[PDB]
Amino acid sequence: AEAFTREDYVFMAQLNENAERYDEMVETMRKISGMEGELSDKERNLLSVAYKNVIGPRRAAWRIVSSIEAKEKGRQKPNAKRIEQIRVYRQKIEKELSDICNDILKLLQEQFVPRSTNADAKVFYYKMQGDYYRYLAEYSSGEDKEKIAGSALNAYNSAFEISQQLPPTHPIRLGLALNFSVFYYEILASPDRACELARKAFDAAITDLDKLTEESYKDSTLIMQLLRDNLNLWVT
Amino acid sequence: AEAFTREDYVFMAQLNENAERYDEMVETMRKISGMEGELSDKERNLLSVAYKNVIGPRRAAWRIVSSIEAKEKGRQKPNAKRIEQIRVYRQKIEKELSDICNDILKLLQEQFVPRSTNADAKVFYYKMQGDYYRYLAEYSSGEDKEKIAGSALNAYNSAFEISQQLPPTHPIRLGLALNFSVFYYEILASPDRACELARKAFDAAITDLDKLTEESYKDSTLIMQLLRDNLNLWVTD
């Protein structure tokens, strides 16, 4: 008559986190995603954290094995067998990346975004979708990377359209701006768009800087704004 | 394409380590353990590195969860729902700890220590048994632990015996001393013997510190030895 409630599943997610056992954290959060309702702001962050700490170590391992492979291929007297040994290892890690990415992209598409009713929640999920597409795009090529990049672009634009409603100083809105910019520069090969989106988001945040500051420092905040004002103006 | 060879598998072991993927390291190192002969010093490190970084995370988690259990129990308003949750979770980690320990202790007792021909290697493998027995003793309870502590104490004493053949500055010897001393202190609750064993190990090493020291820094080693000597004679009185 006194079994587990939702609070108790959130607790395991936190306990998992504390123990740094993120595979289990992903499963505990998956349980909560299967439940009815919308994820709280606490629960959305636990989701993000879990999946970040599962995909994170793989991207690190991928980058290390990729770099080692680059070195072995660029040799004066290359060893085709060792090169293959590495290449096959990378491919294994690439399979784990796409599994993890695929997994969360499913949940976002089929569960989270369809069941979402809030504005800030929509932006969070659309941002997340765009991120994990960007991670797929980081080791893809050809029609795969084009198709992946296209979906990443959509997710981010959806995120970006709705993010207009939230205040310029909102973490999720700034967070989108940061990643979407990095998406333009590092994937889509678009430095202008990257530079400009980062600039505009940053400037919007600089306008409301007084809202992030205590009244104790509001005059320092103002000179900073004025410095930015003059800087913009020059460049006239 | 050609068959992988021992030298290929040592490279994978090392790739595994670079990627910080220690499950795959423990596997490719198990694969080398099955191949001909005895493990080289390089390979014994890889073996050690692999099992340490698999067990290590579990011990970290076990300590964190045990700490959280402690807090939750000593609350003004303890949460019976959580304490059951935490307990079961600790126990899951304890199982994982036990599987990892058995895996390697089994390997040591059936493969490495039997096929060991060197003194160097014998100490390393006996030390290892002591260590992984100690890790079982770390969370084991009551009567069961005592049996484990005995196995640890045995393996460590065996290590300690053959260790006397190795120089006082030899890493395996100093390594054994460190862990045996920790075993006394933390498992056997024997601070007396812990300090004696660590102190002796440490002093025999300071005596030979000239051998670890470069030619350019010998005068500093000597003043350090004389400082040690004076401290021992002064602490007396």
Numbering used by the authors:
A (entry chain A): 2 to 237
B (entry chain B): 2 to 238
How does the study describe this entry?
Each g14-3-3 monomer displayed the typical 14-3-3 structural organization with nine antiparallel α-helices (A-I) arranged in a ‘U’ shaped fashion with a large central binding groove. The g14-3-3 N-terminal dimerization relies on residues largely conserved among the 14-3-3 family members involving, in this case, three salt bridges between Arg22 and Glu97, Asp9 and Lys82, and Glu25 and Lys93. Indeed, helix I of g14-3-3, compared with the human isoforms, is rotated of about 180° around helix H implying a substantial rearrangement of the loop connecting helices H and I (HI loop). As consequence of the helix I rearrangement, the g14-3-3 structure showed a fully open “extended” conformation of the C-terminal region, supporting the notion that the g14-3-3 region encompassing helices G and I possesses a degree of flexibility allowing the binding groove to change from a “closed” to an “open” conformation and thus accommodating different types of peptides. A possible consequence of such exposure of hydrophobic residues is the observed domain swapping occurring between the C-terminus of two g14-3-3 monomers, each belonging to a different dimer, in which helix I' from a monomer interacts with helices F and H from the monomer of the neighboring dimer. Domain swapping entails a dimerization event at the protein C-terminus with the formation of a four-helix bundle between two adjacent g14-3-3 dimers, leading to the assemblage of protein filaments. The overall g14-3-3 crystal packing resulted in stacks of endless parallel filaments, each layer being rotated 60° with respect to the previous one. The observed “extended” conformation of g14-3-3 with the large conformational change of helix I would disrupt the binding groove, which is indeed restored by domain swapping of helix I', indicating that the protein assemblies can retain phosphopeptide binding properties even in the case of C-terminal dimerization.
Eukaryotic 14-3-3s are a family of dimeric highly conserved proteins (∼30 kDa) with pSer/pThr binding property. 14-3-3s bind to hundreds of client proteins thus affecting many cellular processes, including metabolism, signal transduction, cell cycle, differentiation, apoptosis, protein trafficking, transcription, stress responses and malignant transformation. Interestingly, two post-translational modifications (PTMs) make g14-3-3 unique in the 14-3-3 protein family: constitutive phosphorylation and polyglycylation.
